[PDB]
Amino acid sequence: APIPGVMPIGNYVSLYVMLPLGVVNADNVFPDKEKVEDELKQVKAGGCDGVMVDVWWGIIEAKGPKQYDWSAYRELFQLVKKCGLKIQAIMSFHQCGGNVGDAVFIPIPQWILQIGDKNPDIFYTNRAGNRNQEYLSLGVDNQRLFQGRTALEMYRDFMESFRDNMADFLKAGDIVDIEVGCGAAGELRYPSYPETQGWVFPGIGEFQCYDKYMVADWKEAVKQAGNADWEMPGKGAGTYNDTPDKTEFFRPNGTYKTDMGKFFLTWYSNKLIIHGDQVLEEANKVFVGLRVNIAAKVSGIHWWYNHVSHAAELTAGFYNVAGRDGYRPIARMLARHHATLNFTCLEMRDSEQPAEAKSAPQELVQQVLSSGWKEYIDVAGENALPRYDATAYNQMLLKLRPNGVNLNGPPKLKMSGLTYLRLSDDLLQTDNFELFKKFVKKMHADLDPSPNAISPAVLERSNSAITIDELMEATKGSRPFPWYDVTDMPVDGSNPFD
Template sequence: MTSVLGMMNPNLINGRNLHKGSSIFVKVEEIKKRGQWRFSIKEKSLRTPQATASSTTEPKATEFSTTTYEDKMLTNYVPVYVMLQLGVITNDNVLENEENLKRQLKKLKQSQVDGVMVDVWWGIVESKGPKQYQWSAYRNLFAIVQSFGLKLQAIMSFHRCGGNIGDDVNIPIPKWVLEIGDSNPDIFYTNKSGNRNKECLSLSVDNLSLFRGRTAVEIYRDYMTSFKENMEDFISSGVIIDIEVGLGPAGELRYPSYSETQGWVFPGIGEFQCYDKYLRSDYEEEVRRIGHPEWKLPENAGEYNNVPEETEFFEYSNGTYLKEDGKFFLSWYSKKLLLHGDQILDEANKVFLGCKLKIAAKVSGIHWWYKTESHAAELTAGYYNLKTRDGYRAIAKMMGRHHAILNFTCLEMRNTEQPAKAKSGPQELVQQVLSSGWREGIEVAGENALPRFDRNGYNQIILNARPNGINQDGKPRMFGFTYLRLSDKLLREPNFSRFKMFLKRMHANQEYCSEPERYNHELFPLERSRNDESLEKFMEETEPVDPIPWLEETDMSIRPFEGVLSLLQSTFLRKKS
C-alpha cells in the first residue's frame, strides 16, 4: 500500500514547516483491508477513528487536542543502532584501527543513527585469569562513541566468536576456562555422538563450583559487576543505555544445536545438546522421579543435516515428539533452558539494579522447518514450539519478570526468499514471537540475521517494527532495532543513501530525536525482578494464540530508486553550494 504520508511534501512530514505548539488535523480512515490506514493532513486538530458496525461505514471521528504533528509522529519513532565489527577490540585487548573507526562513526552520526552496539568479549577481558579484568580498550572505545554523541548497547558476550554464520574473527572463551575443559570436557555442550562444543559453557554447570571455586553463574555475575564498576561514568551519563546479557551460543538463549564447527549446513535440523554427564544425570534423576527410569535421552533424532522425515523422533504423524516420553523430554529440555535464562537475568538485574538502563536478552529466529508439524530445528535449539503449542510465551513471561527486553532476530527475512526445501516461515515466526512479547506487556526489539542493503529487506524490517503502521498512539511498536553490521560496504554508495532512507522511515520520517522521553523511551532506574509467578506456571501456558494483525506491507516503504534519487539530490546540492 502506498502511504499518503509517504507521498506528501517531505518538509511537512519531518515537521520543519510546523511551529512548536501549533495544532494539526489528521484524519485516519479505515479501508477495507484490515489494519491499513489512510491519512490526510489539515490544520486544526488530530482525530482518530471510532469502532463502527460495518467496515464500509464512514468512521466517526473524535477530536482531541495535541501539541504538534511532530510530537504525535514521534510516538511511532523506532531508534536504530548499528552493530560494530566483531573484532573492533582485538584478541590482544587493543582498539583496532582507531582512526578508521572514528571516520565510520562520524558517517553514522551524520546519517542520524541513534547509537551503536558492541560485543564485550569475556574471552578478551578476563583472558589473563579468574577476576583479572582488563577494561582499558573498551573504555577507550566507549569514550570515542560518546564523543560522537551516540548511545551504546553493550553485550555481555560469554561465548566464543567464530563458528556461527557471519563470524569473521575468532575470539575463544578464556584460556583458563578451556584448560579446565581439557580435564573435564563435560563443562561443554555435548551431542549424542560425544562431540563437545566449546563455544560456551553448558547450562548444566550453572551452579557447579568447577571454575577455581566459582560456578558459571558466579563467573557471569562477577564479570557484569566489574563491568558496572568500571563503566559507571558511561552508565550515569546515559551513554550506555542497554545491557544485553549473553545466554548461550551467539549470545542467544538457546542450545548450540546448529553449529557450523560441528558440520551443520542450512537447513539441517540440528542435534540435541544434552549429553554431557551433568545433563544426562539430571535427566535420569527426573525420569526416575516420575516412575519411568526406562526413558532415555533421544537416540533416534538424526544428525545435524538430516531433514525431519528422515528421523524417527521428528516423523510428522507418529514421531517420538508426539509420544509421552518424547513430550516429557522436550518439556525437560526447554525448561532447563528457561531456568538458565531466568537465573542469569536475575543476577544481571541485581547487578544493574537502580541504574538508568535496560537489560535485554536475545532469542534466535530459527525459521527453517517452521512450516512443518514437528518444528524440528526449533526443538533441537530448545524452543518447544509446535502448531499446537506456543514455545515462546514462557520465554516472554520469564523476561518480563526481570524487566528485560526480548531481542529477536531475522526481522529482514521474507518467506519467498527462502528455499522451498527448508519449509521456512520467517514472517510467521516473527509475528508469533513479537506478538507473544507484546501480549505479555514487555518491550520487544530486533535485529536482522544477515547483512542486507536492499529496499526489500529494509521494508520488511520497517513492517515488523510497526506492524500496524503509523498511528496516533504508536502501538504496537518495536522498542528499537539494531542493524547488522557496520562495514565499508554499508558506507559505500548507493548502499549508504538507501540506509539513510531506512533510518528516516524507522524514525517515522522525523529528524533524529535526542530526547528519548519524546518517543516514550525515557530511562528509569531498573527495578528489582518480580517473583510473583513460578517458571512451572509459565511452562503451563502454551495454548497457541493467533498473532496480532499485521499489514501485508509497510505504509512507509522505501520506493524503487528512492535511495539513488536521494543520493543524486544531495550530490547536486553539495556541488551547488
C-alpha cells in the same frame, strides 16, 4: 482528528549499528583509532542513534580470574560518546568463531578452556560426543568447577565489574542497553546447528543435552515420573543434516508425539528457560535502580516451522508445536525481570527461502512478537544476514510497526528498537549509504534524530518479581495479532494508504 502533517513522537523507533567484529583486538588493543572515528562520524551523519558492541569475555578476563582490563573498551566508548552516539553493550560470554575464514578469533578466557581440557562435560555435547567450546553448558550453572566460582557467579562478577568500571557512562546515560549473553552468539538457545561440526542449512539440527551434568538431571527427573527406564533420544533423532521425515523422532506421529517424547521435550525446553531465568536474575540484581534496559536474545529458527514437528526449533530448545506456544513462557519469564526480548531475525521474507526448507520466517516473527507484547514486555530486534536492498529495509520496517503509524498517538504495536547487522565498507559506500540514510529516516518515521532517547528513553530498572513453575499456563495456544500486509513508510515509495 489529528492535525495534518503532525507525526507524533511515539512512532519513533531507535536504530543502532553494529560495529566491526574486532574493533578491539584479541589482544586488548584498539588500533586504527583515526579511521574508526571517521566511520562513526559518517554513521552519526546518517542519523543513526547509536551502536552495539561485543564486550568479549575472552578479552577482558583473559589474563586470569577476576583480573579484568577495561582499558581499551574504555577508549572505544569515550570515542563513541564523543561522536554523540548511544551504546548497546553485549555481555558476550561466548566465542566469536575462529574458523578458516580468518575473521578475527576470540575464544573465551583461555584458563577456562584449560579446565574443560580435563573436564569436557563443561561444554554442550551432542550424542556422538562432540564438544562445543564457544559457550559453557547450562548443566554447570550451579557447579563449583572454576577455581572456586560457579558459572553463574562468574557471569555476575563480570557484569558487576562492568557496572562499577562503567558507572560514569551509565550515570550519563550513554549506555542504553545491556544485552546479556545466554549462549552461542549470545542467544538463549542450545548450540544445535554448529557449523564447526558439519551443519549446513537447512539441517534439522541435533539435541545438545549429553554432557554428564545434564544427563544426571534427566535421570533423576525420569525416575520421579515412574518411568525410570526412559532414555534420551538416540539414532531415532538423526543427525545435523537430516530432514524431519527421514527421522523417526520428528516424523508425523513420531516419537515427539508420545508421552515419553512430550516428557523429554518439556524437560529439555524447561531446562533452557530456567538457565535464562537464573542468568537474568544476576543481571537484574547487578543493574537494579539504574536507567538501562536488560535484554536477552532469542534466535529466529524459521526452517521446518511449517512442518508438524517444528524440528529445528525443538533441537534448539523451543518446544513450539500445534496447541503449544513455546515462546510465550519465555516472555513471561523475561517479564518477571522487566527484561526486553531481542529477536535476531526479521528482514527475511518467506519467498527468499527454498521451498524444500519449510521455512516461515514471517509467521515466526508474528508469533514471537505477539506473545511478547501479550506478556507485557518490550520486544526489540535485528536482521540476520547483511543486506543493502530496499526489499530488506521494507520488511524490517513492517515488523517495527505491524499496524503502521498512529497519527493519534503511540501505535498499538511497536518494536522498541532495531540494531542493524554491521557497519562495513560495502555499506559506507556512497551508493548503499544513501539507501541506508533513507531507511534510518523511515525508522524514525520521517522525523529528525532525537538524542533524548525518545520512546526507549531508558526507564529505571525494577527489582524482579518471583517465579513459579507456573509457566506451563503460558503454553496455551493463542491468535497472534493481525499484521499489516506492507509497510506504512517504504524507503522508495509513497503512502500505500496502509
